[PDB]
Amino acid sequence: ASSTPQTNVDSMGGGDLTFEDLRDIKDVRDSGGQVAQLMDYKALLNFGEGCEIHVEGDDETKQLVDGEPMTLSEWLEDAFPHLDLLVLDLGGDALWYPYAVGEIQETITGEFKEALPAEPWTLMPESDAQGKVQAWHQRTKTHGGYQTQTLPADDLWHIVINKASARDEVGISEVLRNKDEIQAFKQNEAAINQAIELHGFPQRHVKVGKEDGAPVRDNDLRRVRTIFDPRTTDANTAYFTGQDVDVETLEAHNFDYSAIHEMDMRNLTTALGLPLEAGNVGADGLGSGKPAELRFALLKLAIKANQRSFSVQFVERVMRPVVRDYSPFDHEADIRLEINDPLEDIGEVADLIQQVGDYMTNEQVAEKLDLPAPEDDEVADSYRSPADMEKDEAGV
Amino acid sequence: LEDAFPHLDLLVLDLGGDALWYPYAVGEIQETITGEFKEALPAEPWTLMPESDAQGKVQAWHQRTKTHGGYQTQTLPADDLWHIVINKASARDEVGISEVLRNKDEIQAFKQNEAAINQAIELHGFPQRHVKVGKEDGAPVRDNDLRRVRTIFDPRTTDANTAYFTGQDVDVETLEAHNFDYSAIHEMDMRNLTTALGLPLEAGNVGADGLGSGKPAELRFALLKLAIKANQRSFSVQFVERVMRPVVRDYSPFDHEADIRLEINDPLEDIGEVADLIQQVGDYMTNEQVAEKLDLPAPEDDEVADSYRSPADMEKDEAGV
Amino acid sequence: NEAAINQAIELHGFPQRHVKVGKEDGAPVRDNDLRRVRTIFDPRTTDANTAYFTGQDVDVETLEAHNFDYSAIHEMDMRNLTTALGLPLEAGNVGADGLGSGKPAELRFALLK
Amino acid sequence: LAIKANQRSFSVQFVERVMRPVVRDYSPFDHEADIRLEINDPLEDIGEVADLIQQVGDYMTNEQVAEKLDLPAPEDDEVADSYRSPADMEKDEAGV
Amino acid sequence: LEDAFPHLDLLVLDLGGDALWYPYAVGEIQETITGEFKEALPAEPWTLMPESDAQGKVQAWHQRTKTHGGYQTQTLPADDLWHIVINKASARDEVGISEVLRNKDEIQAFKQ
């Protein structure tokens, strides 16, 4: 076949999105309220439950790093001690913005210090007709003014969850994918807020004079306004009049703002791919059985797809480079990074261990139970429980 | 093959997604600089259209794309390319149909109805105040008068506890919200679009009465599993025959005419069902058959894998020897 | 019936506003006058909190949505179509009491098997 | 999910920004040690932990049980490291 | 460490609470009369504000406070104080986000 591309990728030289569009996403993020909380929930589902680093057959990597042995997983944990939080930041940013982007930072000697995400709204990629990023272009405020620079696609690294196609390197923001729905939610919120002020509360209409009677003017109404004043009226106030004065009622002109709010929240959540429950909106029947379990399946599928999408790119463009550039270990090794299921139940696992432990090794039990495996090979690899091995050892 | 495709889950999701969205998924075979295999790289399907012979088989691929604000166009032979279809028109077809084009009117109707409700809620979902000025069969009222009334009654400066004082010849009426069953319109829209796309209505964040219990529930989930299994098996055969086999042929020291097997996981698999089945009938499954169903590696010793009784049971007995 | 429901929802599912101008047994109002009225009361430029001010001889009526049971029409269409195809009612996204349990439920599965 | 993310976000900061600097500048001990600062979860139920200990204790060490049960580990290393209950060890010893 | 922080629950609750109310929580290091460590002590969070450079890093802490009906003002280096941030604009963010300021309009609307 061939060692280079032969089909084109429908873009070069931009238009796509600008620093202004990036700053729109940022302005959504810091605006707070329900819209921000929904995307923060979207982040907390995908990335809030944390992660673990693994390497396949890691006992084969065992090497003296500085006169004492380590595995590659131990070395990677020294490179990424607090990885859950780096995953939460990058993953969150990659849900807000089309991409996440960062530097690698070094000690004064040149050995690795940390991985460091950059501020995503400040940075935009520039790319070729082949389909690849060639440079990173940055615009930033300072002293209330502005400054601009460009950096190569060489010492920076970047990640893209929401690709336009499998071959893409820029992606699309789920915010910009649903811009109209987001604005419509906020507009309908503003509508309900003002409509409650105007129509949610009864109001008092004092009418003065008789039908076809004597005229009433402003200096007359000013005196009447002073008598029936809502500023100084109280719960037990009573009124005494001639027949030619009426205290009429503007009733609260009832409307189902609740159902409108639910409709808005349903439209926004389904558009953002989120469960309706994250908008705190209820429904009958749908809370139980296969009707429920299907939505939980759809939710878990989306999460697993995102998690695996992130992990592969983080391994391939962050972890492997960090090994390549700073490590005594092989950088082409079978590195792994799992991100946890946010809707896993320990009870389900504990039931499974009782039901089918007779067919799972103690290491397979420990792994499912989220614990380290035993310190002895047959104790880990066997299917008889370690308690069963101990009670027999005490008596045989 | 695991060295050839380390991240196959993501490629299967992308290609399967493309083959549901578009009529086909389509791609190149890509190599390292040394010439050994790299990946089966897909190409952006909206940019590519097929050209075919008198027997209907695709012999070339035609591409049209934007660059630098302008355009470029090209044609390539199908000889070093590959393509996959989920939704064929017939058993003789090779190009297929997109469900987006098949149900185009339903999709447009859904979008129109959402826009219609969105507008109708603004116009009819909120009450609106109508101040009427003057007396019936009385003196006239002109714009410069209404401007002065509007200045007092301005909703921009009104509050929840505001009170109004008038002579008898001003009425502060309201257009009450002319309520309509938009909820049922939403349910109908979702019913229409989900069933057009073959999904159960429950997937669209909309309910159904009575249908939430017994085998009257299970039938929809069964129909969904049927569609999924059919689609998955349809994809696997094509990926094996038109991607995996050519890759083994050109880059592997093995024979490509051996039977490669590719399976895709089921979203409606139940771990509790598997666990109960293992408890109830494990006495009739090999340890490898248990492992394959339980999502595990088989035992590392041949007779331990091949045997029917539990490995733990064989171990707890052997401890007595 | 699908085409009928589609148009009937547009025509009768949504309320529609009717501005009436002039007084009963009063002066007439012409198209060039109504063009000026329309320009004010335009739903294109109206919002949820818009308020209206008039003399006594302008009215804003609404055609209320004339509720009809299109859901039940859909249920009958679906009952007809499913039975015509020989399918059970549940295949059409419709269900009922009495049929939803026990031997009444078993019979549909028996017929389908 | 929000609580667990916040708690880990805090623990990491308090260890790195306060504890390790204090050890570095004022302690005879090494500051680069693995401080496991943890914050308790008010939405966890001890009833779930009690069920779990019954259900899968045969596959957990006594130290792991002690961690989950929110108590100190046994004072003898093999008793802490082993998987079967210390009460089973005690009843067997009285039997012997 | 247990001798250094006997009552750590209270300090964790205070710092955590403050870092949810305000953009950050912040404190001093203190010594005994002899000069060995005494405690790490949290400061009045509304009274201190950071000042920062082009690489986004805090370089000084600025304090303004009431006494005797008047005001006192002082500035300190970003060195002997220590600070913690729960909510952030980016991984680089040293200044942080207050959920009170993030939802200021919703809070006022509720009270109204």
Side-chain angles (χ1 to χ4, degrees):
Chain A
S2 59
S3 303
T4 55
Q6 62 208 51
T7 55
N8 300 322
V9 199
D10 211 28
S11 177
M12 186 166 177
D16 184 30
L17 80 168
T18 69
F19 297 116
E20 316 311 315
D21 307 294
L22 267 38
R23 287 176 190 270
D24 257 14
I25 300 161
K26 172 64 189 298
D27 286 355
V28 174
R29 188 178 196 277
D30 80 1
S31 72
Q34 294 160 87
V35 174
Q37 185 56 53
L38 283 168
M39 181 59 74
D40 290 341
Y41 282 145
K42 198 167 159 86
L44 281 167
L45 282 163
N46 285 272
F47 303 110
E49 199 61 286
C51 57
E52 190 161 48
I53 304 168
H54 306 277
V55 182
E56 188 58 286
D58 204 5
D59 290 356
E60 295 296 334
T61 76
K62 285 279 287 289
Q63 177 169 206
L64 306 180
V65 172
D66 192 9
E68 188 167 39
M70 297 184 183
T71 57
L72 178 56
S73 59
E74 283 158 322
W75 190 89
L76 282 164
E77 282 192 308
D78 286 348
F80 308 104
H82 315 297
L83 182 60
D84 308 316
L85 306 181
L86 177 59
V87 163
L88 180 59
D89 289 347
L90 286 170
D93 288 352
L95 288 166
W96 274 109
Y97 309 90
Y99 45 75
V101 51
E103 304 178 5
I104 301 295
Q105 277 293 325
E106 294 171 9
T107 57
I108 279 73
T109 171
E111 281 63 37
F112 176 97
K113 184 200 178 204
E114 63 192 327
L116 177 59
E119 299 209 305
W121 67 88
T122 72
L123 278 162
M124 68 182 192
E126 299 191 355
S127 60
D128 61 24
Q130 137 183 253
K132 292 188 65 68
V133 177
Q134 287 291 345
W136 280 98
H137 188 168
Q138 199 184 25
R139 205 185 80 209
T140 47
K141 296 189 64 61
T142 51
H143 304 89
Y146 257 115
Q147 288 176 242
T148 317
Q149 69 167 355
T150 304
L151 294 170
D154 195 11
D155 60 351
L156 290 169
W157 49 264
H158 95 274
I159 295 169
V160 185
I161 299 176
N162 295 293
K163 287 197 183 203
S165 66
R167 187 173 160 185
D168 185 17
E169 293 197 347
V170 180
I172 297 292
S173 166
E174 285 250 285
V175 173
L176 297 183
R177 199 186 181 196
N178 301 285
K179 189 73 175 286
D180 298 346
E181 286 72 21
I182 288 168
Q183 289 198 339
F185 183 94
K186 282 195 172 188
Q187 284 172 359
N188 291 0
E189 259 283 358
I192 290 161
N193 178 259
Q194 187 70 14
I196 291 294
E197 191 72 29
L198 294 170
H199 314 278
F201 297 88
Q203 287 141 70
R204 188 159 278 176
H205 187 193
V206 176
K207 265 169 169 162
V208 185
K210 200 171 78 82
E211 178 180 8
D212 297 344
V216 185
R217 276 61 163 269
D218 280 20
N219 293 320
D220 319 330
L221 294 177
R222 281 166 172 164
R223 285 167 174 95
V224 177
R225 179 183 69 177
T226 305
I227 294 160
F228 297 84
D229 193 353
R231 178 180 46 160
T232 65
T233 294
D234 64 29
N236 299 294
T237 294
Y239 306 100
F240 317 85
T241 72
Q243 290 286 1
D244 307 315
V245 178
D246 293 311
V247 182
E248 263 289 11
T249 290
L250 293 159
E251 291 191 337
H253 293 105
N254 296 295
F255 67 115
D256 196 350
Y257 56 91
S258 300
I260 300 164
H261 204 270
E262 286 182 357
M263 184 199 74
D264 293 332
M265 187 59 77
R266 196 192 310 258
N267 274 23
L268 180 61
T269 51
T270 306
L272 292 175
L274 279 166
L276 183 58
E277 297 78 10
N280 309 155
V281 169
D284 295 345
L286 287 182
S288 186
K290 299 299 171 190
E293 295 163 40
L294 174 65
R295 298 198 312 291
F296 281 67
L298 284 170
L299 180 55
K300 286 188 292 181
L301 287 159
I303 291 158
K304 289 177 76 180
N306 291 335
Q307 285 175 340
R308 294 177 84 75
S309 291
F310 182 92
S311 284
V312 166
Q313 296 184 46
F314 187 85
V315 168
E316 294 279 27
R317 292 199 303 273
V318 191
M319 302 177 78
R320 282 180 161 169
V322 164
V323 179
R324 182 195 66 199
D325 297 342
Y326 308 101
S327 198
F329 294 91
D330 183 3
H331 69 275
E332 303 197 348
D334 298 301
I335 300 170
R336 286 164 54 205
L337 174 57
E338 69 178 336
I339 307 168
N340 297 324
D341 182 346
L343 301 172
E344 177 172 286
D345 187 353
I346 300 164
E348 182 77 354
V349 171
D351 284 342
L352 183 69
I353 289 161
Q354 288 201 127
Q355 284 197 289
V356 307
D358 299 328
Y359 302 88
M360 307 198 289
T361 69
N362 299 318
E363 62 174 34
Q364 285 158 5
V365 165
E367 285 165 19
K368 288 182 184 289
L369 188 55
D370 194 20
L371 290 174
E375 289 291 338
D376 191 14
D377 297 344
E378 77 172 85
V379 182
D381 192 39
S382 60
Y383 302 78
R384 52 183 161 133
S385 83
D388 295 316
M389 289 182 279
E390 287 169 353
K391 72 183 69 157
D392 285 352
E393 179 169 25
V396 167
Chain B
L1 286 166
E2 286 177 41
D3 286 340
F5 305 92
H7 318 299
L8 186 58
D9 308 319
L10 303 179
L11 183 62
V12 165
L13 177 57
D14 288 342
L15 294 178
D18 285 353
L20 286 170
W21 268 106
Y22 306 91
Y24 40 78
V26 57
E28 304 176 3
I29 298 296
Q30 277 295 331
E31 295 172 15
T32 57
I33 278 83
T34 171
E36 283 61 39
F37 184 59
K38 190 198 180 207
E39 59 196 329
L41 178 63
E44 298 196 312
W46 66 90
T47 71
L48 281 161
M49 72 180 189
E51 298 190 357
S52 58
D53 61 25
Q55 289 82 8
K57 200 269 153 285
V58 174
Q59 298 291 353
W61 279 99
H62 189 156
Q63 200 183 20
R64 193 181 85 197
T65 45
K66 288 172 68 76
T67 52
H68 307 98
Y71 281 88
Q72 290 173 245
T73 311
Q74 65 163 358
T75 306
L76 296 171
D79 200 19
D80 67 336
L81 298 174
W82 58 267
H83 93 273
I84 297 175
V85 173
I86 296 168
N87 296 313
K88 285 195 178 196
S90 74
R92 273 289 175 113
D93 182 25
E94 216 189 28
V95 176
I97 299 291
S98 169
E99 287 291 321
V100 179
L101 302 180
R102 203 183 177 195
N103 312 275
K104 190 72 171 290
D105 299 350
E106 288 70 25
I107 288 163
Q108 287 186 345
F110 184 96
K111 282 193 173 188
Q112 281 177 339
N113 292 357
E114 287 290 345
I117 298 159
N118 179 263
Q119 183 75 346
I121 291 291
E122 178 144 47
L123 296 171
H124 316 283
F126 298 92
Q128 291 139 68
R129 197 161 273 175
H130 186 192
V131 176
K132 261 169 167 162
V133 184
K135 197 176 76 85
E136 190 174 57
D137 300 332
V141 184
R142 277 57 171 278
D143 281 18
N144 287 334
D145 318 334
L146 296 178
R147 283 168 175 145
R148 285 167 170 84
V149 174
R150 183 186 68 176
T151 300
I152 298 162
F153 280 89
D154 194 355
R156 183 185 52 116
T157 72
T158 295
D159 68 37
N161 291 282
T162 297
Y164 303 93
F165 292 82
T166 77
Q168 289 286 0
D169 310 316
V170 175
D171 292 315
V172 187
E173 266 295 354
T174 282
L175 298 163
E176 291 192 307
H178 290 106
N179 295 309
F180 68 108
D181 195 355
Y182 54 89
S183 299
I185 306 173
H186 262 111
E187 291 187 346
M188 194 188 72
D189 284 336
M190 196 56 69
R191 178 184 295 273
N192 291 358
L193 184 58
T194 53
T195 301
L197 295 174
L199 289 166
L201 179 53
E202 297 94 317
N205 307 111
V206 163
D209 297 320
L211 290 181
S213 184
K215 292 203 175 285
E218 296 181 3
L219 182 60
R220 288 179 309 292
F221 309 91
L223 283 170
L224 180 56
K225 285 191 297 182
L226 269 163
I228 292 161
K229 287 177 71 174
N231 293 339
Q232 286 178 339
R233 291 176 86 77
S234 299
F235 187 90
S236 287
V237 167
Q238 293 177 76
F239 192 83
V240 168
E241 296 276 45
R242 297 205 296 271
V243 180
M244 302 181 86
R245 280 181 152 156
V247 164
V248 172
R249 183 194 71 202
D250 294 344
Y251 311 113
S252 196
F254 292 79
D255 182 2
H256 69 281
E257 299 195 329
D259 283 336
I260 303 165
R261 289 162 46 191
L262 171 62
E263 69 177 314
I264 308 165
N265 299 328
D266 183 343
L268 295 168
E269 177 186 295
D270 186 344
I271 296 165
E273 192 87 290
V274 171
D276 289 350
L277 189 71
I278 288 160
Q279 285 207 135
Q280 287 190 288
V281 311
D283 307 336
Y284 303 90
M285 290 189 283
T286 69
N287 293 315
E288 62 171 22
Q289 285 157 4
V290 170
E292 283 175 1
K293 289 180 184 291
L294 188 51
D295 187 23
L296 290 173
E300 296 292 338
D301 195 1
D302 300 352
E303 66 178 22
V304 183
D306 186 49
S307 52
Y308 291 84
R309 80 184 196 112
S310 154
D313 286 351
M314 289 184 290
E315 285 177 330
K316 72 187 64 156
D317 289 346
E318 191 167 37
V321 174
Chain C
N1 294 355
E2 285 275 54
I5 289 164
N6 179 264
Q7 199 75 10
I9 288 291
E10 180 143 43
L11 293 168
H12 313 279
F14 300 98
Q16 303 215 319
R17 189 162 275 177
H18 185 193
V19 183
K20 264 167 165 161
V21 190
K23 197 177 75 84
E24 182 178 24
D25 301 335
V29 178
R30 274 56 166 270
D31 281 18
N32 291 323
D33 317 328
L34 292 174
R35 283 165 171 163
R36 286 163 170 90
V37 174
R38 175 176 73 177
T39 301
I40 298 174
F41 289 92
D42 194 353
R44 177 186 52 114
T45 70
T46 294
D47 65 38
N49 293 286
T50 297
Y52 301 93
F53 294 86
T54 74
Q56 288 287 4
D57 306 317
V58 181
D59 300 314
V60 182
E61 291 296 338
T62 280
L63 291 157
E64 292 180 14
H66 292 102
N67 296 295
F68 68 108
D69 197 346
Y70 56 89
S71 297
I73 301 171
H74 262 174
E75 286 176 19
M76 193 185 72
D77 292 336
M78 192 53 71
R79 195 186 310 264
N80 294 344
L81 179 60
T82 51
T83 310
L85 292 169
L87 290 170
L89 185 61
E90 288 85 1
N93 320 106
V94 175
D97 289 342
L99 289 181
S101 186
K103 300 219 162 284
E106 293 161 31
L107 184 69
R108 279 187 309 299
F109 299 106
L111 285 168
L112 182 51
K113 283 189 292 182
Chain D
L1 288 160
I3 291 161
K4 289 169 93 280
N6 289 339
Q7 286 181 338
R8 289 182 68 67
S9 299
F10 188 92
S11 287
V12 165
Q13 286 178 85
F14 191 82
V15 166
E16 301 276 43
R17 304 274 269 209
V18 186
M19 300 177 77
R20 289 178 158 167
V22 164
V23 174
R24 183 195 67 205
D25 296 346
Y26 297 98
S27 192
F29 297 96
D30 181 9
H31 71 279
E32 295 203 325
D34 293 321
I35 302 162
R36 292 169 60 204
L37 172 62
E38 71 174 351
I39 312 173
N40 301 326
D41 181 359
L43 300 181
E44 188 164 58
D45 189 349
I46 298 162
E48 185 64 24
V49 174
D51 285 344
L52 181 66
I53 287 165
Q54 285 204 140
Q55 286 194 318
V56 305
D58 301 339
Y59 301 90
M60 298 192 288
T61 63
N62 294 310
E63 66 166 35
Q64 281 156 338
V65 169
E67 277 188 324
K68 288 185 182 288
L69 185 50
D70 194 18
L71 292 174
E75 289 292 341
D76 189 359
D77 298 354
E78 74 177 52
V79 181
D81 182 52
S82 49
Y83 289 81
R84 78 181 189 131
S85 165
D88 293 343
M89 306 174 215
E90 286 171 353
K91 72 185 70 153
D92 285 348
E93 181 169 17
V96 171
Chain E
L1 286 168
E2 284 167 8
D3 284 348
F5 311 103
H7 315 302
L8 183 59
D9 305 316
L10 305 181
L11 181 60
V12 167
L13 174 58
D14 287 350
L15 290 173
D18 291 351
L20 289 169
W21 272 102
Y22 309 89
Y24 40 74
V26 52
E28 297 181 350
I29 300 295
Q30 287 199 4
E31 290 168 18
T32 54
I33 284 76
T34 170
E36 288 70 22
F37 176 84
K38 171 191 168 190
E39 67 191 321
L41 182 69
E44 304 304 86
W46 66 89
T47 67
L48 284 160
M49 71 182 189
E51 297 189 13
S52 62
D53 67 15
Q55 88 212 297
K57 294 190 70 64
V58 180
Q59 298 294 355
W61 277 105
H62 193 164
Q63 204 195 15
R64 200 191 84 203
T65 50
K66 293 167 62 72
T67 54
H68 298 103
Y71 261 109
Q72 295 182 236
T73 310
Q74 64 176 351
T75 310
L76 301 171
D79 189 17
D80 59 340
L81 295 172
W82 50 268
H83 96 274
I84 295 174
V85 170
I86 295 173
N87 304 300
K88 287 189 178 184
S90 71
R92 282 178 157 288
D93 184 7
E94 296 198 351
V95 175
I97 301 292
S98 164
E99 284 294 335
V100 175
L101 298 182
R102 200 187 183 197
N103 310 286
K104 186 72 174 288
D105 296 347
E106 288 68 29
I107 288 162
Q108 285 191 340
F110 184 93
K111 285 196 174 192
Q112 284 175 0

